[PDB]
Design a protein around this motif. Sequence first.
Motif, PDB file in Angstrom:
ATOM      1  N   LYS A   1      -8.349  -5.839   8.667  1.00 33.96           N
ATOM      2  CA  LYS A   1      -7.181  -5.334   9.419  1.00 33.96           C
ATOM      3  C   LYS A   1      -5.962  -5.056   8.522  1.00 33.96           C
ATOM      4  O   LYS A   1      -5.101  -4.276   8.911  1.00 33.96           O
ATOM      5  CB  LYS A   1      -6.817  -6.304  10.561  1.00 33.96           C
ATOM      6  CG  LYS A   1      -7.877  -6.389  11.677  1.00 33.96           C
ATOM      7  CD  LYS A   1      -7.428  -7.361  12.783  1.00 33.96           C
ATOM      8  CE  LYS A   1      -8.460  -7.449  13.919  1.00 33.96           C
ATOM      9  NZ  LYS A   1      -8.051  -8.437  14.950  1.00 33.96           N
ATOM     10  N   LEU A   2      -5.913  -5.636   7.318  1.00 29.78           N
ATOM     11  CA  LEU A   2      -4.863  -5.415   6.313  1.00 29.78           C
ATOM     12  C   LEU A   2      -5.200  -4.262   5.333  1.00 29.78           C
ATOM     13  O   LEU A   2      -4.412  -3.957   4.427  1.00 29.78           O
ATOM     14  CB  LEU A   2      -4.560  -6.737   5.573  1.00 29.78           C
ATOM     15  CG  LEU A   2      -3.958  -7.871   6.438  1.00 29.78           C
ATOM     16  CD1 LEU A   2      -5.015  -8.740   7.132  1.00 29.78           C
ATOM     17  CD2 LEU A   2      -3.138  -8.810   5.549  1.00 29.78           C
ATOM     18  N   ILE A   3      -6.372  -3.629   5.511  1.00 30.29           N
ATOM     19  CA  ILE A   3      -6.840  -2.458   4.744  1.00 30.29           C
ATOM     20  C   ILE A   3      -7.185  -1.226   5.602  1.00 30.29           C
ATOM     21  O   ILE A   3      -7.112  -0.118   5.082  1.00 30.29           O
ATOM     22  CB  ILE A   3      -7.982  -2.832   3.760  1.00 30.29           C
ATOM     23  CG1 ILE A   3      -9.233  -3.484   4.390  1.00 30.29           C
ATOM     24  CG2 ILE A   3      -7.438  -3.786   2.681  1.00 30.29           C
ATOM     25  CD1 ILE A   3     -10.260  -2.500   4.960  1.00 30.29           C
ATOM     26  N   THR A   4      -7.504  -1.362   6.900  1.00 26.95           N
ATOM     27  CA  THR A   4      -7.708  -0.212   7.814  1.00 26.95           C
ATOM     28  C   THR A   4      -7.115  -0.474   9.200  1.00 26.95           C
ATOM     29  O   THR A   4      -7.434  -1.466   9.849  1.00 26.95           O
ATOM     30  CB  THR A   4      -9.193   0.171   7.984  1.00 26.95           C
ATOM     31  OG1 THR A   4      -9.984  -0.958   8.298  1.00 26.95           O
ATOM     32  CG2 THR A   4      -9.792   0.857   6.756  1.00 26.95           C
TER      33      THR A   4
END
Length: 11
Positions: free
Chosen positions: A8-11
């Motif tokens: 969730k911190l990358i997409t």
Amino acid sequence: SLLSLIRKLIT
């Protein structure tokens, strides 16, 4: 495991 949160911190 780790790919279930940080995802969730990358997409």
